[PDB]
Design a protein around this ligand. Structure first.
Ligand SMILES: *[C@@H]1O[C@H](CO)[C@@H](O)[C@H](O)[C@H]1NC(C)=O
Lengths: 49, 49
């Protein structure tokens, strides 16, 4: 119960939510950039346009 | 309904583009009619015409 030690390691947990996203694909088929729609007005305009 | 409208997308993008063009055109119309000059002249106090 006590004769142990924990090494240095970390993790982060974030909860998914229903949202709209814009995604860009390069010429090789992979994603390079994305925009979270409805984050800030600038992102909202990127999303609309 | 928004999710179903998402896959159309380009249609009302085109609609908004057209309407924005119309609005810009209206401002252009008013400017080209009324802003023929830029020196804002004013009438003299004396109306000895
Ligand atoms: C796509 O694949 C080719 C294969 O060599 C590579 O030369 C090129 O750099 C890749 N393009 C990008 C944007 O990574």
């Amino acid at each position: 119960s006590s004769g142990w030690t924990a090494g240095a390691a970390a993790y982060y947990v974030g909860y998914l939510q229903p949202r709209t996203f814009l995604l860009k694909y390069n010429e090789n088929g992979t994603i390079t950039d994305a925009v979270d729609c409805a984050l800030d007005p600038l992102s909202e305009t990127k999303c609309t346009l | 309904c928004s999710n179903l409208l998402l896959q159309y997308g380009s249609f009302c993008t085109q609609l908004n583009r057209a309407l924005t063009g119309i609005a810009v055109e209206q401002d252009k119309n008013t400017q080209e009619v009324f802003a023929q000059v830029k020196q804002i002249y004013k009438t003299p106090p004396i109306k000895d015409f």
